[PDB]
Amino acid sequence: KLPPGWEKRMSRSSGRVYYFNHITNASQWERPSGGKNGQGEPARVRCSHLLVKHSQSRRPSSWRQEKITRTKEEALELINGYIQKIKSGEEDFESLASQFSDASSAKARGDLGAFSRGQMQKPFEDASFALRTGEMSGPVFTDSGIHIILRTE
Structure with a gap:
């Protein structure tokens, strides 16, 4: 689950769980998504x-x-x-x-x-x-x- 590039992670030497995007390098506490499929990326x-x-x-x-x-x-x-x-x-x-x-x-x-x-x-x-x-x-x-x-x- 989760949009492209997104994965749930945890801080090192810390317990704070968060979400990180390996493609945009973005980090946030909020889950990136709460069902659309084959959507691909914008042209x-x-x-x-x-x-x-x-x-x-x-x-x-x-x-x-x-x-x-x-x-x-x-x-x-x-x-x-x-x-x-x-x-x-x-x-x-x-x-x-x-x-x-x-x-x-x-x-x-x-x-x-x-x-x-x-x-x-x-x-x-x-x-x-x-x-x-x-x-x-x-x-x-x-x-x-x-x-x-x-x-x-």
Whole structure:
């Protein structure tokens, strides 16, 4: 049971049971599903994203700063921080993407418009098509950096 990529898990050195998606890297306390079959994946999706680049990004540079020097671990720490902030309700995805995304799409609040498979980098693509409308991904790693993805359509 459970939608694609989803599996029930438990925290190490902890007992907290939760659900994790191996494709989007998303984690949540709520069970992802409460019967539709042969549904497959959407042929086209619309997603927004928040990208945090690091020194190993295929291009350690963005509109935010001339030279990206933070490491991958530092970027992941920032990504985890944005996720937690969005999940608490303290900040919203759009405002954080507009302010802190190292991607130029920040001017459009992270919105990338609609796309099909074969257009984006594989990891980003895989997470995007495994998301259901309104869902947000966990940390997704690509050559560009680390992203937080939100499917809007």
